[PDB]
Design an enzyme around this catalytic site. Sequence first.
Site, mmCIF file in Angstrom:
data_model
loop_
_atom_site.group_PDB
_atom_site.id
_atom_site.type_symbol
_atom_site.label_atom_id
_atom_site.label_comp_id
_atom_site.label_asym_id
_atom_site.label_seq_id
_atom_site.Cartn_x
_atom_site.Cartn_y
_atom_site.Cartn_z
ATOM 1 N N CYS A 67 0.968 -1.298 0.022
ATOM 2 C CA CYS A 67 0.041 0.193 -0.012
ATOM 3 C C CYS A 67 0.750 1.206 -0.033
ATOM 4 C CB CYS A 67 -0.811 0.032 1.245
ATOM 5 S SG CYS A 67 -2.097 1.210 0.983
ATOM 6 N N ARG A 104 -0.033 4.620 2.592
ATOM 7 C CA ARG A 104 -0.252 4.454 4.090
ATOM 8 C C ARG A 104 0.089 5.662 4.768
ATOM 9 N NH1 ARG A 104 3.808 0.013 4.991
ATOM 10 N NH2 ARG A 104 4.162 -0.217 2.682
ATOM 11 N N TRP A 114 -9.206 6.094 -1.652
ATOM 12 C CA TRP A 114 -9.502 6.680 -2.865
ATOM 13 C C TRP A 114 -8.042 6.290 -3.645
ATOM 14 C CZ3 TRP A 114 -8.634 9.661 1.683
ATOM 15 C CH2 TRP A 114 -7.125 10.300 1.791
ATOM 16 N N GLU A 153 -3.695 3.595 -11.216
ATOM 17 C CA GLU A 153 -4.553 2.335 -11.060
ATOM 18 C C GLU A 153 -5.582 2.260 -12.135
ATOM 19 O OE1 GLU A 153 -5.523 0.966 -6.930
ATOM 20 O OE2 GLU A 153 -5.093 3.009 -6.442
HETATM 21 C C1 HEM Z 1 -6.474 6.242 1.124
HETATM 22 C C2 HEM Z 1 -5.821 6.271 -0.177
HETATM 23 C C3 HEM Z 1 -5.274 5.116 -0.498
HETATM 24 C C4 HEM Z 1 -4.435 4.890 -1.690
HETATM 25 C C5 HEM Z 1 -4.078 5.964 -2.444
HETATM 26 C C6 HEM Z 1 -4.068 3.485 -1.627
HETATM 27 C C7 HEM Z 1 -3.252 3.088 -2.741
HETATM 28 C C8 HEM Z 1 -2.910 1.480 -2.808
HETATM 29 C C9 HEM Z 1 -2.157 1.268 -4.111
HETATM 30 C C10 HEM Z 1 -1.897 2.228 -5.366
HETATM 31 C C11 HEM Z 1 -2.012 -0.062 -3.829
HETATM 32 C C12 HEM Z 1 -1.550 -1.062 -4.765
HETATM 33 C C13 HEM Z 1 -0.772 -0.860 -6.009
HETATM 34 C C14 HEM Z 1 -1.402 -0.536 -7.296
HETATM 35 O O1 HEM Z 1 -2.696 -1.103 -7.406
HETATM 36 O O2 HEM Z 1 -0.989 -0.058 -8.114
HETATM 37 C C15 HEM Z 1 -2.775 -0.389 -2.748
HETATM 38 C C16 HEM Z 1 -2.937 -1.556 -2.153
HETATM 39 C C17 HEM Z 1 -3.325 -2.092 -0.893
HETATM 40 N N1 HEM Z 1 -3.884 -1.322 -0.094
HETATM 41 FE FE1 HEM Z 1 -4.095 0.852 -0.176
HETATM 42 N N2 HEM Z 1 -4.758 2.830 -0.646
HETATM 43 C C18 HEM Z 1 -5.432 3.789 0.037
HETATM 44 C C19 HEM Z 1 -6.227 3.400 1.183
HETATM 45 C C20 HEM Z 1 -6.141 2.140 1.909
HETATM 46 C C21 HEM Z 1 -6.885 1.587 3.192
HETATM 47 C C22 HEM Z 1 -8.019 2.479 3.623
HETATM 48 C C23 HEM Z 1 -6.662 0.173 3.409
HETATM 49 C C24 HEM Z 1 -6.910 -0.654 4.468
HETATM 50 C C25 HEM Z 1 -7.639 -0.095 5.467
HETATM 51 C C26 HEM Z 1 -5.558 -0.150 2.284
HETATM 52 C C27 HEM Z 1 -5.076 -1.339 2.326
HETATM 53 C C28 HEM Z 1 -4.387 -1.910 1.135
HETATM 54 C C29 HEM Z 1 -3.828 -3.223 0.858
HETATM 55 C C30 HEM Z 1 -4.341 -4.363 2.039
HETATM 56 C C31 HEM Z 1 -3.310 -3.429 -0.274
HETATM 57 C C32 HEM Z 1 -2.760 -4.622 -0.928
HETATM 58 C C33 HEM Z 1 -4.088 -5.097 -1.571
HETATM 59 C C34 HEM Z 1 -3.680 -6.673 -2.238
HETATM 60 O O3 HEM Z 1 -2.487 -7.042 -2.290
HETATM 61 O O4 HEM Z 1 -4.509 -7.139 -3.055
HETATM 62 N N3 HEM Z 1 -5.306 0.900 1.560
HETATM 63 N N4 HEM Z 1 -3.208 0.676 -2.197
HETATM 64 C C1 LIG Z 2 -8.488 0.452 -0.627
HETATM 65 C C2 LIG Z 2 -7.610 0.704 -1.967
HETATM 66 C C3 LIG Z 2 -7.376 1.866 -2.549
HETATM 67 C C4 LIG Z 2 -6.536 1.910 -3.689
HETATM 68 N N1 LIG Z 2 -6.496 3.261 -4.261
HETATM 69 N N2 LIG Z 2 -6.147 0.805 -4.518
HETATM 70 C C5 LIG Z 2 -6.198 -0.291 -3.546
HETATM 71 C C6 LIG Z 2 -5.649 -1.479 -4.461
HETATM 72 C C7 LIG Z 2 -6.662 -2.077 -5.540
HETATM 73 C C8 LIG Z 2 -5.819 -3.259 -6.246
HETATM 74 C C9 LIG Z 2 -4.739 -3.080 -6.667
HETATM 75 C C10 LIG Z 2 -4.218 -3.896 -7.580
HETATM 76 F F1 LIG Z 2 -2.950 -3.770 -8.267
HETATM 77 C C11 LIG Z 2 -4.816 -5.316 -7.290
HETATM 78 C C12 LIG Z 2 -6.036 -5.619 -6.750
HETATM 79 C C13 LIG Z 2 -6.376 -6.848 -6.696
HETATM 80 C C14 LIG Z 2 -5.291 -7.817 -6.097
HETATM 81 C C15 LIG Z 2 -5.662 -9.083 -5.976
HETATM 82 C C16 LIG Z 2 -4.801 -9.705 -7.345
HETATM 83 C C17 LIG Z 2 -3.577 -10.741 -6.656
HETATM 84 C C18 LIG Z 2 -3.982 -10.535 -5.087
HETATM 85 N N3 LIG Z 2 -4.949 -9.479 -4.698
HETATM 86 C C19 LIG Z 2 -6.558 -4.500 -5.846
HETATM 87 C C20 LIG Z 2 -6.985 -0.607 -2.753
HETATM 88 CL CL LIG Z 3 -9.018 -1.272 -9.186
#
Ligand code: HEM
Ligand SMILES: Cc1cc(N)nc(CCc2cc(F)cc(CC[C@H]3CCCN3)c2)c1
Ligand SMILES: [Cl-]
Lengths: 402, 404
Positions: free
Chosen positions: A106, A109, A278, A283
Amino acid sequence: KFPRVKNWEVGSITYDTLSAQAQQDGPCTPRRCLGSLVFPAPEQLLSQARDFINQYYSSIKRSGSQAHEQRLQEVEAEVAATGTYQLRESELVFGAKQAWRNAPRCVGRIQWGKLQVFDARDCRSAQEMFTYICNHIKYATNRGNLRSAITVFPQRCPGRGDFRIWNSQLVRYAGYRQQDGSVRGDPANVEITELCIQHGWTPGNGRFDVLPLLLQAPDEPPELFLLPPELVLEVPLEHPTLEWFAALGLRWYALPAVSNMLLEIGGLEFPAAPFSGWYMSTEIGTRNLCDPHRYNILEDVAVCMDLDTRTTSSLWKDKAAVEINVAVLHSYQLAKVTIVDHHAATASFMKHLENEQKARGGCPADWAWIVPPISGSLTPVFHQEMVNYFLSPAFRYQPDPW
Amino acid sequence: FPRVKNWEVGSITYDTLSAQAQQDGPCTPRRCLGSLVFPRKLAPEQLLSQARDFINQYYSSIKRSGSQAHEQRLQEVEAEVAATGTYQLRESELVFGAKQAWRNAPRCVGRIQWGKLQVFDARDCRSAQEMFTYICNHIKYATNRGNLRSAITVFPQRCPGRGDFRIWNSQLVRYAGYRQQDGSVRGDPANVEITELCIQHGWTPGNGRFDVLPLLLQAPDEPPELFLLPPELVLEVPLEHPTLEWFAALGLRWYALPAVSNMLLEIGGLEFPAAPFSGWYMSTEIGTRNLCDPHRYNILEDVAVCMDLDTRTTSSLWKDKAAVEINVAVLHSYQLAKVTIVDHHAATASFMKHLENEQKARGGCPADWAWIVPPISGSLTPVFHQEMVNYFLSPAFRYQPDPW
Ligand code: HEM
Ligand SMILES: Cc1cc(N)nc(CCc2cc(F)cc(CC[C@H]3CCCN3)c2)c1
Ligand SMILES: [Cl-]
Ligand code: HEM
Ligand SMILES: Cc1cc(N)nc(CCc2cc(F)cc(CC[C@H]3CCCN3)c2)c1
Ligand SMILES: Cc1cc(N)nc(CCc2cc(F)cc(CC[C@H]3CCCN3)c2)c1
Ligand SMILES: Cc1cc(N)nc(CCc2cc(F)cc(CC[C@H]3CCCN3)c2)c1
Ligand SMILES: [Cl-]
Ligand SMILES: [Gd]
Ligand SMILES: [Gd]
Ligand SMILES: [Zn+2]
Ligand SMILES: [Zn+2]
Ligand SMILES: [Zn+2]
């Protein structure tokens, strides 16, 4: 023997002493690194609990106190009598923020302390589950001024099935297979589309059809619930200078809400705890619209841009991709929907690393996921070495319930 | 046997080659250190065991194990070590080993070419002036008037006691880095340290922003001497943009030949502290890293000003727009000058083909995801969605200390 960590853009050097408290194990060995991989009774339960309670009472600057040992005593007693235990509301809120703080992929964070925690642990049915979820989407969306939130449904418990949300996100577009064999809509969602259909959903035929929710109450089949259309805020996509871009008919939704992960706190597991924040603009622009196995619009965009798609050396792919991201950022800004670009996101994540190094002596981070999928070396995270490891509380992947 | 998935196509393989590894990498079950640039930090009974392994895979590759002349090479090597402690490589083993070290390099995206490598044998060398002449042959051959050919020159192996052949520059062609008045730098900040060892050993400094540094060549024991590179031997490319008239006015150039001159070739338990290898550039190396890195030439904002981009908000993606055009200019300029270059799309697509080949041939391929994915437009290339396994095979190019 704590890992030395260097930033190569600046020369900074830190040592990651937190990695030594890594409470579980990952896929690498001294033989081989597997870091790029996407997917890497009372006694064990009791030690996870003690460690968490210790974290909690450390956080409130009250470690080793009367209330601390009382709670330690209570939990051991409760695990004896019932095989499990219940979190106090304050401990739940702390555990949810820690799980986000600990999430190594993430980039968002910096925000971890500003999380809204909805306690739905008294939920009793899929109908009530739906109401909670609709309230989550409404609060988090907040008319475009998005707020981070999580809703926690009841924990896993012996003798009863799990609450589960079958959808991987609360808002997803359908993917329909075709006569061409192709997919209409989002190819990532073909499976869940087919499940919704055979659970009685009447499918549409568009590219951006919002899917219903399949909600599973303990020991019941999943139940289908339609999202009120006025609950799902969407953004039509246009480009500030490329006027034909609006004519592609592209849209994306405001709220990224991951609904299929398992929240783990002090040995307790919550198979249903959807969380939302958000979007970072790559993404949408890079992954969801440009991946060949997603909406795959890149060549159609480049052709309309009058770029030479005959040779790779003209960098038609890179130019079309940048303009798609510009269109995403401009469109969300126009619509007054929170969005962060990858330059701002990675800058705040670097501030987050500094904060965490002082607070905890390290920060678990997955380089390959933290570095954005376009313009990586233009962002400050690219030249920062990172240590990936698993801390608890945590969000974990879990198998699909079907 | 690790499962390895490509998330774009859905194909699966199993990396069986990883099991046959093991100079111990830095990761443990409790924490991954895959993003670290240097895996931590830098009685000959085991020389034999490393030589026997290498000899065995040489005869494996030429269909020639179990019968043969390979059992006889096995005994001459152990007799050689029993007599002098080290041993000499046959010339074809040396060729085979150099190609295998390149094939085994996890961070190299250009490995589809690993079978076309010209190997100059320079082990009978004994003078730093000799070295300079060897290096000068290599550069001339490798450059080939802009039609670049991969080449390595192999200098004498380190031996018990004694001293080391060592090139002191990190590459054969490096631009000068002059600190200054402000503590600021004119030229290449990557080369500030070596630019000052050059002057402290007798070099007269230069102009500024693009001065080819002189070579610092170190023959065993004897201290390093400076050698000037002939401007005839250093092919350079002035940078111009196909449609941005003012880009040439920025006075940007880069050189033709990338030649790494500070890594240690290790073959069958033998160490070669001087074994400069050279190929051709991938364009993001020049345009994205060398020109745009905040700690390199850092030209991004200068180009953005000239393009009249909105540099007042990050969300204009002015860095992204500027960066692509710099890469367009790199590619166009090398092509116009008829100098071999490869773009990151072509280079990663060739690397995917290499992965397919390697799966049939050896059951896998050590690959370092963070270095194989290009520094711009990563997810637009086929390697981004490809999972990879990193591990150490021998022969290898290793990092080595720096005689400071
Ligand atoms: C508030 C703005 C937030 C932003 C900008 C953000 C951004 C991101 C991004 C960009 C990724 C994955 C990398 C990608 O998709 O390119 C990600 C993954 C993740 N985020 Fe955040 N996030 C936010 C909020 C949160 C919140 C509120 C939570 C949990 C309470 C969270 C937990 C996670 C988790 C667990 C992953 C890994 C998901 C997976 O491996 O499938 N995020 N986040
Ligand atoms: C709360 C939140 C905010 C944000 N702004 N972005 C995300 C990540 C969304 C996301 C990004 C990825 F790149 C891949 C997934 C699904 C992951 C699956 C595939 C393999 C394991 N879990 C979801 C989460
Ligand atoms: Cl998405
Ligand atoms: C012929 C075309 C070649 C191309 C296009 C090429 C490309 C590259 C690139 C792009 C990188 C670093 C990744 C990056 O900067 O994004 C790299 C690293 C490397 N290459 Fe290749 N290379 C070529 C030839 C060779 C040859 C001939 C050798 C050795 C005989 C070699 C050995 C290596 C090694 C050892 C590294 C790692 C260097 C380090 O760790 O600092 N390459 N190559
Ligand atoms: C985390 C990370 C990932 C990645 N993918 N890449 C890097 C930068 C790699 C790099 C490139 C260079 F061009 C030079 C250096 C440092 C060389 C200095 C240190 C000692 C002597 N010279 C490092 C860092
Ligand atoms: C033969 C060759 C051809 C080519 N086209 N490209 C290269 C890569 C040149 C290169 C790229 C890097 F990214 C970093 C370095 C040196 C950095 C030191 C510090 C740590 C490890 N190596 C060199 C080599
Ligand atoms: C090697 C690699 C590096 C990286 N940085 N990223 C990826 C892609 C990760 C990814 C992103 C997604 F958005 C979706 C998936 C697959 C989800 C499937 C599995 C189960 C259900 N849907 C994978 C791969
Ligand atoms: Cl270079
Ligand atoms: Gd226009
Ligand atoms: Gd302006
Ligand atoms: Zn690892
Ligand atoms: Zn993708
Ligand atoms: Zn860089």
